[PDB]
């Protein structure tokens, strides 16, 4: 759809759309930018992730409202509308996963890009798992786990324990364990170990990096407070 627009113009419009809180537009601009076929810089990866996380975040909030009403009712209208929203959400997740598979991940060789994209792949399978029912859920859950695990293996080998991508990956994988995989003890252990290893590495950081790492570390602490 965006084939006639310059890559640089799509990126510029994605930034404008973010300022205007037009996240569907932002995601469409960034999809067009990915489909130009070039790798994405760090800033461009952030734009792609922010766009789709906002789009799917709105869909997830709406799905939860409708699912709650539907369960409180158990006419066809609530189920029909929940199903409509669910299909839209699944379509957005499939689109993101398609961009990762064609061809962002296979061209991502540096740890920062490859870990970032694999974390995204885990996240979007996780969002699919939130609405999945049955044995379909099982394979979707394994797909999320496998993506997160590969990202974790790379991040432990290639990034310091305070790296914000490494920290956010561990945070989200811990949420996967707690909320999706029914493994609260694994979630707690991962969050604790991540927090403790980051704490021990803070002395190496500049003031600005310290602010970034400690902010995410507090998110790990917030989850541990809720879980224990």
């Amino acid at each position: 759809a965006m084939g006639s627009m310059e890559r640089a113009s799509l990126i510029q419009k994605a930034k404008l759309a973010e300022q205007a809180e037009r996240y569907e537009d932002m995601a469409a601009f960034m999809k067009g930018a990915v489909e130009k076929g070039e790798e994405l810089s760090c800033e461009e990866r952030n734009l792609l992730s922010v766009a789709y996380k906002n789009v799917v975040g709105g869909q997830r909030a709406a799905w939860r409202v409708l699912s709650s009403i539907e369960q409180k009712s158990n006419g066809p209208e609530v189920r029909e509308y929940r199903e409509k929203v669910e299909t839209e959400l699944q379509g957005v997740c499939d689109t993101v996963l398609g961009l990762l598979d064609s061809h962002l991940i296979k061209e991502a060789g540096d740890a920062e890009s490859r870990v970032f994209y694999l974390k995204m792949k885990g996240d979007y399978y996780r969002y699919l798992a939130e609405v999945a029912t049955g044995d379909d859920k099982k394979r979707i859950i394994d797909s999320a786990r496998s993506a997160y695990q590969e990202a974790m293996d790379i991040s432990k080998k290639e990034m310091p324990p305070t790296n914000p991508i490494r920290l956010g990956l561990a945070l989200n994988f811990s949420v996967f364990h707690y909320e999706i995989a029914n493994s609260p003890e694994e979630a707690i252990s991962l969050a604790k170990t991540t927090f403790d290893e980051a704490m021990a590495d803070l002395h190496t950081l500049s003031e600005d990096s310290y602010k970034d790492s400690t902010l995410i570390m507090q998110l790990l602490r917030d989850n541990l407070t809720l879980w224990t």
């Binding site: 952030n46 922010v50 998110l219």
Partner: peptide, 9 residues
Amino acid sequence: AGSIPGRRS
């Protein structure tokens, strides 16, 4: 339980 709030920047 909160995941990364990656809705800004």
